[PDB]
C-alpha cells in the first residue's frame, strides 16, 4: 500500500490544492490520512500481522509538504513569459522520463551478467554514472526558493561537465559497435548490448535536457528581482550551451544514424531467431527517431545603444522641477531590452548613469529601428527596481517613465502628499490605467494604497474600468482591496457599486472570498449591507464564503452568522460543513458561536464521517472536552453510516490513545457497537496493542468475549499479535482459552501458522488442549508441518501428545511432512520421532504408495528406513 | 595529581558563582593555588603556574558563552552540545585501542590509507583543541577566516569514506575468511569521527549565528540558518536517507560475521556494544513573508505630527516579522520592500495578512542597526508600536525635560506602559536605569502595582536597577512607596545592597542605611556577607555599614575567607586600617586551617606584609596550624617568596624551633628548597644545624641525596657531620650512594668519610654501590673500600649480587681485570655453582658462571 498510496499522494500533488488557498496544513493532512484509511477500508487479520495495516501513518505528510513546496517553487506569475522555454522542455521531458521509467526495470533486467565482453565493464561504469545522476536528481526539487537557488549556485558546473562527461565514452560505444558487428555476424551478447547502448543514449539526452531546464530556471530567478547583470551572462551561457548542444548532438546523432543502419543490417542479415525485447527496442527506435527530428524545433536587437542618443533638453510642462520621489542627483540606470510574441530578451547595461538637474525626456531612436521587435526600457535610479519603467510599442519620450512616476505616486502612503503628487501629475495628466508589471497597475494599485477619494473625484470617467479591469492574474480592483481592507474606499466604490460576485480569471473566486480570510470585520459589513450578495456562493471548488471565513475566526464570522439570510449549513466538495472546519481549525469561540446560532447539523461527509470522529482521530482533547460539555449530540456514541464505526474505533486505530481515555472517563459508554465483521472495539484494540486502554476498559467491565463473524477471536489476535504480553494480560482477565473459531481453530493453530513460539509456550503452561482438532480434524501440528516452522515444530514434538495418526484423510502427520517434502525436516522426523515405519498403514502401503506413485529420488529410498 | 586539580578546576567552572563578581579572577586563582598546596600535603619529593593558567583559560571559555535571553536556536545548541559530549566520551574511550591498532602494522596494504586517516584524526584534534582557548572576540575572530576551511573539510573528508567502504568490503572478505578485527575497529573509529566532526561543525555554526543575532546582520542570520539546514540535510542524505549510508554496510558486515562459525577475540564483542551505540545514535539521528504595503494610519485623530528626534524626521523605514515564543524562531529577510516613509509615525501594522495560529513578532528598523522590536499578539494590531517605542525611548533618554515632554505627549496620544519592549519592561525599568522626573512617578502612581513588582526577563525589580545605577535621589523617589528591599532576583538571588556594594555609589547605600528596616546580615552564595562585597569595593563606603548596623564583623565564609584575607588580596591599607579599628582580627584558622600571614606570603604583598608587621597586634608571625603545623614562613619557604622571607627574617620573633610532622623543621624545608642564599641567611641567624627528623635525619642526610654538591660544601662550612648515621645508620656516604651521585661521595671522602661503614644487615658501602650497580660508584669503592666480602644472615657476598645483576665489565673487574683472588669463596666454593644449578638458567649464562 506504500507505493500505491504514494501514487495517490502524487495524484493529490498533481491536484495543486494551494492555488485555492483554503488548505491549512491540518486541513490538508488529516483529510488525506482519512482518505487513505477509507480507500484501504475493510477489515481482516493478515493486515494486522504488521504486513500492510499501519506501516505509513505520518511520514506521508513529508511528501505532502514536498508536493506543496514543489508547487510553490513555480514562478509567482513572472512578468516576463520567458518561462515558455521551461514549459516546452518539461513537456519534452515528461515522455522521455516515463520511457526511462519503464527502461528502469528493463535495465535492472539487463544486469543478467557481467564481462561477456570487456566493454560490459564500461557499460557498468556508465550505468553507475546514470545512477549517480538519478541519486542527485531526487534531492533537487525539494527545497524552497532560497535553498533551491543555493543548491543551484554550485551544481550547474558539475552538470556542465556531466554533459561534457568526464569520460566521453562515445568512442567506447563506437568500439563496441565495431565488436558487435562481428558478434551479430557470428549468429547474442551484443543483442543484449544494443539495449544498453540505446539506454545510454537516452540517459545522455535526458541529462542534456536536465541541464537545459535547470539553466532556464536559474535565468528566471535572475530575472524576477535576481542578479540583473548576471541575467545576461546566464542567457549567453545557455545560448552557447545550446550551440554546443546542437553541434555535439549532430555528431552523436551521426553515430546514432550509423547505429540505425547497422540495426537494420542485422535485422535483414540475421536468421529468424531474435527477442521481442528487440521488438520493443525497435518501437523505441521509432520513438528515438521522432525525438531526433524533434531536435530541429529551436540583446543584439536590444543594446547597441545608450540613453544619450537624442537628448531632449527642456520645454513646457517638463521643466526641471525638484520633486521628492524623482530625486535630483541619483544615477539614471537606463536599460532597454526586448519582449514580443512571448519571446523575451532582457539586457542589463546602465552604461550612462549621468545625473543632471534636468529632465529625462530624451528619445533613444526607437522609432527608426527596422526590426519589428517590440522593445521596453526600464530606468533604475540606484538599485534593481521592479524593472518595468517604460513599454514603448514604437516610441518613448520619457512619457511612459512619467507614467511609472505617477504609478509610484499612487504607491505613496501619505494622504495629502499623495494629493499633491496627483496635482503635480495632472498638471501634465499622464495616461492612467496603463498596465505595469503585467498588472493594470495604476487604478488597482491606487485602490490598494488608498486615497480612492481623490482618485475617484479626479478620474471618475469609466466605472467599467473600475470594475472589470483584470490583470495578468485577472484581478479586479475589488479583489485587489479585498485582503487589504480599504473600508472607507470600499464605501467609495460601493457608492457607484461594483460586481458583487466577480470571479477571477484563474481559480474563479469572489473578491468577497478573497476578503474572507483578511479578518476585516470593519470592512466586510459594506458588502454585507448594500446588495445582499449571495451568501451561499460556491467557487470552483465548492467552499462557502462562510467556509473561507472560518479561517479568520474573528467577529467577522459572528456578524455573518445570523444577521443576513444565510445558508447556516451546507456541503463542501467532499462534504464539509463550516462546522467541520471549526472542529478542525480548533477555533473554540467560533464553534461555540455556531452552536449558539444553530444546533449541530452533524451531517456525515462523502465517506460517511461526522465531525465527531475527527477529534478522536487527532486527539482534539480541548474540543473533545467542550463537546462532552455540550452534553447533547450523543453521536459520540453513534456509528459511521458506511460501516457502523464509533470515533473510538478510529482513535484506537490511529494510536492517538489519549482522547480515547478521555472519552472512556466521560460517562457510561456503549461498547456493544458492532461493525463490519462483528469485531468489537476490544478486538480492534487487541490488534492495535495498547494495554493502557485495555485494562481501562477492563475496569469499566468491558465484555471480554464476543465471537466475531470473521471467524476470529481476540485470543487468536493475541496469538498473532507480535506483543506476547497482551495474551497473558487477557489471561489474568479470565479470557477463556477456548475462545476458538467457529471452525474450532484454536489460537494454537493460529500460532502454529505464525511461528510466534513465545505465545505458543505461554498457552502450554496455560494448558490449552492439545488433543483437540479443528473442523477438518487437523491438530495445530498439521498446520505447523504445513508451514514448516523449525522451533515451533520442535516444541510440538516435545509436547505433541499425539500418536501421529490419520486425519479425515488417511495421512499421518508424517504423511503431511511427506507431502510437504521438507527433506531436512523429513530426516529430522524419521528417527527422533520414533521410526516404527514398518506396516504403519495397511501393509504399510502409504510409504509403498509413495514409491509406486511416481519416479521418486533415491533420497526417499534412504528415507524408507 | 595534576588531573585532580584539573577536575577541581572543572568543578569550579561548572558553577556560575565565580562568574559572579562576588568571587573575582584573582580572588579565585589564589585559593586554587592554596588548595593545590593543601592536597599536596617527604623524602622522595626532596629528590604551579600551569594550574592557574588552566583556571583562567577555563573561565575564559565560560565567558565565551552568550548572554541570557539573547537569541534563537538555543534548543538546537543545547541538544547538539549534549549529544556532542555523549559522542566525545566514547570517542575518547575508544582512542586508546585505536592507537593499539597501529601495532599490527602491514598485514594489509591499505594500512597506508589507515595512517592517512590517522593523520586526518591528528589534524582534526589539533584544530579542535586549538579552538577552545580564546576569549569571545578572539574566538569569533579565529572562527571567521577558517570557517571556510572547516566547511571545506566537511567534504574533504570524502576519500576517508570512499576508501573506508572499500576497506569494509575487504574486511568482510577477511572476517568471513577466518587480523581484520583491528581494521573493523578502525572502521568504527572512522564512523564515530565523521559523526563527531559533523556535530562539532554544526554547534560552532549555531553559536556563530547566535552571535550574529546581536545587532549583526539579519541577512547573515538567514545565511547561517541556511548553512545549518544544508549541513543537516547533507547528513540526512549521506548517512540516513534512502541512499545506503555506511551505517547500512557496517550493520550488514556485523550481521554476516555474526554468523561466522569461528571463535574470535573480545575486540568483536566490544565492537558489538559499539554497534549498539551506533544504532541508538541512528534512532536518535533519524528524527512569514508579509509587509505593510499600503496601510498607513490616516488622521482619524491625534496623529498631530511632532518633530520627534527619536522617530527621526525625513528618514526611511525598514521592517520584517518572524514567529517565536514556542520552540524554534524561524527567521526571514524582507528588506527589499521597505522604502521611504515620512509625515507622522502611523503604520497600521496589519498582522492580519496571514492571521494564522502563530505569534508573529515584528521588529522595526531603518537605515542603521535599530531598536528592532514592536509588540506581540495574534490578532489585529493598530500601530500602538509607535507610541510604545517612543515611550521606552523617552524612558531611555538622558535629557530629563525632553523625557517629560515625550511622556506627557504620548500618553495623551494613547497607549499603555504595561506593554513590554525588547522582552524587557524598558518603558518602566529604563526609568530606573536613567532616573526620572516627577511625572514618571505621577503617571505610574495610578496603579502603584505595575512597576514595583514588575519582574524583567531576569526577574529584577526596579530596586535592583536603581541600586546598580546608584541613582540615590530616584531611589528615595521610589522607596517613598517602600517595596521589598529584599527583592532577590530570579537567577543568583541576592540583595540590592550587594549591587550597591559592587557598583560603589555611596550616597544610595547611605540612604538605604538611613531607613533600612532590613536584614542587612544576609549571607550570600559561599557564606559571604555584604561586608565582603564592600571590601571588594575598596572605598570608605564600607564605614557606613561598619558603624551603624549590627553585622558580623568577624564573618567567615564557606572557603574560610575572612574580610581580612579579602583586603590582603585587594591591598587597600586604608580599608584594612578601618577594619582593624572596627573590631577584632579574624585570624581564625579556616577550613584549610590557614592564617592571613599565609596569604600575605602567598601574594608576596610586601606592602601589606609590612603593614601587618607594623600592626604587632595578634600578628602571630610564628603561628602553626593543626595540619602539620605549617607556618607562614613555611609557605614563604615553599613558594620561594625569597624577598618577603628574608624581610620577615630581619625581624625578631622568627621562631627557628618550629617542629612539623615528623620533626621536619624550617632548616629541613630550606634544604628541601635549594634556595641557598636564604639558608645562608638562616645560618647567620643561627638555627640548629643538626636539627633532626623523626627518622633521625640531620639536614645533611637529605642534602646529600641531592643533585648538586655545593650545598654539601656550604653545610660543611657550617660544620655538618660527614659520617652522621641514620635510623638505618645510612651515613652521608650511604645516602650519596643511594642516589648515584659520584661527586657527592667524592666530596665526602675528601673530608674523611668512613668508607668502612657497614649497617646491621651488613650492607657495606660496597654493598650499596653494587646495589645501585653504577660503574663509577663501584670503581670508586674498589679505589677505597675495595672488597670486604660481607654478606647478610643469608650469606650473600658482593660477588653474589655482582653476578645476579648481570653486568659484564664490573664482574671482570672483580675476577679478570682486578681479580678478587677468591676461589672456593664459599662453603666448598660451590654456592656460585649452587646458583648455577638451582633452577632454570640462561643460554648465555655459561660465561656468567665464571
Author numbering:
A (entry chain B): 50 to 236, 245 to 355, 362 to 928
B (entry chain A): 50 to 90, 93 to 98, 106 to 236, 246 to 354, 366 to 928
Study text:
Latrotoxins (LaTXs) are presynaptic pore-forming neurotoxins found in the venom of Latrodectus spiders. LaTXs bind to specific receptors on the surface of neuronal cells, inducing the release of neurotransmitters either by directly stimulating exocytosis or by forming Ca2+-conductive tetrameric pores in the membrane. The structures reveal that LaTXs are organized in four domains. A C-terminal domain of ankyrin-like repeats shields a central membrane insertion domain of six parallel α-helices.
As expected, mature δ-LIT was toxic for our insect cell cultures and therefore, we expressed, purified, and subjected to cryoEM analysis the precursor uncleaved inactive toxin. In particular, reference-free 2D classifications revealed approximately 45% monomers, 50% dimers, 2.5% trimers and 2.5% tetramers. Interestingly, such particle populations of oligomers were not observed in negative-stain EM, indicating that the interactions are rather weak and dilution of the sample which is necessary for negative-stain EM, as well as the low pH of the stain might induce dissociation of the oligomers. We were finally able to obtain a map of the δ-LIT dimer at 4.6 Å average resolution from 81,192 particles, with no symmetry imposed. Based on the structure of α-LCT monomer, we were able to build a molecular model of the δ-LIT dimer, including residues 50–928 for both protomers. As expected, the structure of the protomer of δ-LIT is very similar to that of α-LCT (sequence identity 39%), showing the characteristic G-shaped architecture and domain organization. δ-LIT displays however a shorter repetitive C-terminal AR-domain, containing only 15 ARs instead of 22 in α-LCT. The δ-LIT dimer is formed with the two protomers rotated 90 degrees relative to each other and the plug domain of protomer A plugging from the side into a cleft formed by ARs 1-6 of protomer B. The plug-domain has a hemispherical architecture matching the cleft formed by the 1st–6th ARs of the AR-domain, suggesting an induced fit and shape complementarity as the basis for the interaction. Besides the main interaction between the plug-domain of protomer A and ARs 1–6 of protomer B, there is a less pronounced interaction between the helical bundle domains of both protomers, involving H9 of protomer A and H6/H7a of protomer B. Whereas H9 is interrupted in protomer A and in the structure of α-LCT by a short loop in its middle, in protomer B (thus most probably upon dimer formation), this loop folds helically to straighten and complete H9. In comparison to the compact conformation of the truncated α-LCT monomer, full-length precursor δ-LIT (both in the monomer and dimer state) shows a different, rather extended conformation and a larger distance between the helical bundle- and the AR-domain.
